[PDB]
């Protein structure tokens, strides 16, 4: 193999920068409108199944 | 001994021809084997990375 180490490097590089949703309120929305839905999203998408 | 004496004459012939001396060629480890050893070592070094 001369290509698989490249795949390993790319996978490790992108695993070092996790990305997840971040809800934000609308322009005219209240400055605390997104807290409850974001909290529920964190609650649901924190188990091992989501990361896997 | 400071010499290496050789017989010069043969009975039923003239002098010994005494062709130039030949030696068994030294073992070589053909460069195919060495080059493939280097290639295999380099390959193992490249794949032996988890990142």
Tokens coding B22: 């030949």
Contact B46 A5 (CB under 8 A): yes
CA-angle at B44, arms to A8 and A6, nearest 5°:
20
* CA B32/CA B38 separation, integer angstroms: 10
Looking at the complex, does the CB of residue B9 fall below 8 Å from at least one CB of chain A? Answer: no
Q: Tokens 């043969």 label which residue?
A: B10
Tokens coding A46: 């924190």
Tokens coding A50: 């989501």
Q: Tokens 């649901």 label which residue?
A: A44
Experimental method reported for this structure: cryo-EM
**Full DSSP string of B5-49:** ----B-TTSSB---PPP--PPPP---HHHHHHHHHHHHHHHHHS-
Distance of CA B7 to the CA centre of its chain: 28
Q: Cβ-count burial of A38 within 10 angstroms (0-12 exposed, 13-18 middle, 19+ buried)?
A: middle
**Full DSSP string of A1-52:** --SHHHHHHHHHHHHTS---------SSS-TTTTHHHHHHHHHHTTSHHHH-
Which positions 12-51 of A are in contact with B (Cβ < 8 Å)?
Answer: 12
A–B CB contacts, 8 A cutoff, strictly below: 17
Contact A1 B51 (CB under 8 A): no
> A40: distance to nearest CA of chain B, Å?
35
Burial letters for B22-44: b for 16+ Cβ neighbours within 10 Å, e otherwise?
eeeeeeeeeeeeeeeeeeeeeee
Contact A44, A36 (CB under 8 A): no
Contact B49 A2 (CB under 8 A): no
Distance of CA A35 to the CA centre of its chain: 16
């Amino acid at each position: 193999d001369v290509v698989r180490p490249v795949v390993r490097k790319l996978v490790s590089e992108m695993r070092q920068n996790p990305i997840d949703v971040l809800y934000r309120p609308k322009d005219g929305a209240r400055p605390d409108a997104a807290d409850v839905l974001m909290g529920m999203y964190r609650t649901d998408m924190r188990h091992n199944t989501a990361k896997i | 001994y400071p010499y290496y004496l050789l017989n010069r004459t043969d009975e039923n012939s003239g002098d010994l021809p005494t062709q130039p001396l030949a030696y068994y060629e030294n073992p070589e480890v053909p460069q195919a084997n060495a080059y493939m050893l280097e290639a295999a070592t380099s390959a193992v070094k490249e794949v032996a990375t988890l990142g």
